[PDB]
């Protein structure tokens, strides 16, 4: 039992259950090629991690301000609030920093193990891990990278990506934050749904 996305359907051959979260879901056959699968697994990892962080950032502040602890704006309108630096300055700083770190990650992906070493202090190299899972300084608490935990990470990331899609579509169609939508639906579920929204 590798997990079946359709009980009555067999899983694709190129999927063998080795990868965490492998439930045999790939109707479009996007991973017929081992290299394509190897690239897409990393794509999924990074997309899921970013999605989890983003959905947390959009959700937790909203509920916290709704219950009355902090007074943050909504995620969609948070762009206008003036910060200590100009928006363009922040964007360019972020661009430089990410242009460095993401290229480091890319070099790791292309040929594993070539960028485990600190480029300034010749000591302090990362432990020889696996692509997409660089331990060492990135894992201070040193939680075991057990396979079951990897599956939990993958599942939570997929849920977060679905949630972000919902966040943006709900904001586009309704015009407010997700938590307000949930609260309104809870107030009267039988007259507050997509049908009445549309």
């Amino acid at each position: 039992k590798k997990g079946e996305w359709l009980p009555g359907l067999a899983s694709p051959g190129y999927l063998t259950g080795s990868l965490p979260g492998d439930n045999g879901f790939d109707p479009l056959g996007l991973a017929e090629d081992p290299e394509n699968l190897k690239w897409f697994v990393q794509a999924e990892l990074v997309n899921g991690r970013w999605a989890m962080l983003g959905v947390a950032g959009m959700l937790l502040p909203e509920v916290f301000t709704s219950i009355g602890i902090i007074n943050v704006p909504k995620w969609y309108d948070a762009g206008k609030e003036e910060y200590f630096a100009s928006s363009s300055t922040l964007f360019v700083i972020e661009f430089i920093l990410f242009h460095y770190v993401e290229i480091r990650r890319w070099q790791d992906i292309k040929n594993p193990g070539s960028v485990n070493q600190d480029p300034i202090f010749k000591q302090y190299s990362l432990p020889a891990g696996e692509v997409g899972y660089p331990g060492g300084i990135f894992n201070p608490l040193n939680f075991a990278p057990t396979l079951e935990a990897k599956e939990k990470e993958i599942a939570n990331g997929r849920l977060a990506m679905l949630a972000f899609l919902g966040f943006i579509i709900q904001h586009n169609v309704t015009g407010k934050g997700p938590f307000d939508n949930l609260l309104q639906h809870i107030s009267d579920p039988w007259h507050n749904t997509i049908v009445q929204t549309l």
Partner: protein
Amino acid sequence: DIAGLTPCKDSKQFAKREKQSIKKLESSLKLYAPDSAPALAINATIEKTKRRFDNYGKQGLLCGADGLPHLIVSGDQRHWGEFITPGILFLYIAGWIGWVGRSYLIAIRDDKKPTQKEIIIDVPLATGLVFRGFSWPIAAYRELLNGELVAKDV
């Protein structure tokens, strides 16, 4: 505005043409009975014309001295709805069609008599293949990078 044109909403010849079109349509209506099928059809057409002109004014199209909408395709972000996002949509659909057809041709190329599956379409296989065009933008990209989109040795 761009190219010396003016917005259709505040243009005058556009409004004159709108009025003239409605007047022409109404001219026929007065001949029939007030509430007959031809009269209802003509009224529906008049309402359609009014809605069309109002929508054209609403979207912010540009009107020339002729009073007709003109499409800007230079790339101005104020007019991406005129050619660029429809262009992207067309490219997506056309690549869908071409990729699906190419996938079918490659799939049936291994039989002893491939021509038989070309004049008599193997629908079972085609129904499975047609859905690859949802993600053809990725399949073709990785097909090119992997270097097997283009037939080498040729």
